[PDB]
Amino acid sequence: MVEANLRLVISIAKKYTNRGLQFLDLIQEGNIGLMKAVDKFEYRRGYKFSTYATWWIRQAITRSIADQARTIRIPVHMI
DNA sequence: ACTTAAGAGTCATTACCTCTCCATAATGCGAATAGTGTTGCTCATTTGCTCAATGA
Question: Where is motif Interaction with polymerase core subunit RpoC found?
């Protein structure tokens, strides 16, 4: 299930490119979020995979670029 | 068994003066931990003051 939606990870992380982080770091952290979405996925709500996986991939990419992008790190609640 | 081509690597002066320019984006909600305030308390530091011998 994980190695069939990596194209979804590169499709999400295509837009977060020039935000202070490398392109390969983004899709790596998106893969971490994709694994966390695979482990907690429920099929009985009719949705296929993508509407549940997109939120977790976007969350992992945003929490990656909110912390590991600057030296003087501001937490996400303060920013 | 040896001889020309392709590709990679590594340098190309010294010293000083002036100026500009060096960033933008998800939300929220408990859990848990670090931080700050409170009160009672002890301990080290210094200083004016006191007490005891002693010769003139």
Answer: 25-28
Phi-psi region for residue A38, left (φ > 0), alpha (ψ -120 to 50) or beta? alpha
Q: End-to-end distance of chain A based on CA atoms, in angstroms?
A: 35
Entry resolution (Å)? 3.5
Contact A61, A29 (CB under 8 A): yes
Pairwise CA distance, residues A40 & A52, whole Å = 9
Residue A56 (CA) to nucleotide B43 (C1'), in angstroms, measures 58
Q: Are A50 and A5 in contact (CB under 8 A)?
A: yes
Nucleotide nearest to A71 (CA to C1'): B23
Please give the Cα distance from A51 to A21 (Å, whole number).
25
